[model samples]
Target: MENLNMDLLYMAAAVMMGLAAIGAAIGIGILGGKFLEGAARQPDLIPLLRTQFFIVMGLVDAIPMIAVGLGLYVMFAVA
Candidate 1:
């Protein structure tokens, strides 16, 4: 019974990670496309846009990073 529960937990964790990856990929794709379009339109603003890009990248990465941490904990931490 305990083993079954653990298996279920691991499966749930995997699903969560998979969903997180999908969300992150879609989000980054949209953001990057917008950033490129903006940069292309305003070449002089590239520097400022680059700075903003890094900041947004960090924000976008945080969710996926947290999901990865949670997934790792679920895999390794004994309940």
Candidate 2:
């Protein structure tokens, strides 16, 4: 029945977003760690480093947002 299909869809959407969140978590954590490493080298360069971090931070944040959007679309439209 369509109900069964919807059940699978629910699982699919959950897994899709779940893995995406996990991936983004790891990526951001690593990015922050590396940023700290660089900041330690030259405190004066923190201004430049901060801007660079902000740029990459945008990409990392975008990835999970995109996945969440797709997941929501699947739940709302497909299901």
Candidate 3:
């Protein structure tokens, strides 16, 4: 029935957003760990490392935000 299709669409949207969140979390976690390691090794570069970490964290978050936007469109527009 048409209702079943709607249910499936919601499921797809959920999966898309959830996977994006998981991927972004893993990426930021690793980035932070690497940043800490570098700062520990060279305290003088902490300033540079902080800037790089901020930039990379923003970049890493873009994918998840895009995915969430798409999911919202699907849930609101498609439904």
Candidate 4:
């Protein structure tokens, strides 16, 4: 069989990437939800806060993207 070990190796890489992605998702979701609660207190700055949230999400996601790219290589190339 040209399989089995490589399959588990693939599984491991995929799981590693999944952890990074899920971590990012949970972090961004909680921060975003908490930010919305503060919106009512500063209605005038709503537009500014909304802009800040988008900027934050954009800036914070670099690590997860790297993990996925490396994981893809591990699954398809090395493993």
When 1 and 4 are scored with lDDT, the better candidate is 1
| Model 1, residue 52: C-alpha shift (Å) | 6.5
Q: Which tens-of-lDDT digit does each residue in 1-79 have in candidate 2?
A: 6676667656765776578657866786687668757875678877857775776666786765676667557766755
User: Alpha-carbon error at 5 in model 4, in Å?
Assistant: 16
Error of 4 at 38 (Å): 0.5
**Worst ten in a row by lDDT for model 2:** 63-72
Cα deviation of 29, candidate 3, in Å:
1.6
Please identify model 2 stretches exceeding 4 Å from their true place.
Answer: 1-14, 48-53, 69-79
Model 3 earns a TM-score of 0.50
What's the C-alpha lDDT at position 15 in model 1?
76
1 or 3, greater by TM-score: 1
For each candidate, the alpha-carbon lDDT, in order, equals 0.68, 0.69, 0.69, 0.65
TM-score of 4: 0.47
State the local distance difference test value for candidate 4: 0.65
For residues 1-79, could you state the per-residue lDDT of candidate 4 as single tens digits? 3376566656665676578567767876777667755763588768857775776565556675565557657656765
Q: What is the lDDT of residue 41 in candidate 1?
A: 70
Per-model TM-score, in order, reads: 0.51, 0.48, 0.50, 0.47
Local error of candidate 4 at residue 54 (angstroms): 1.5
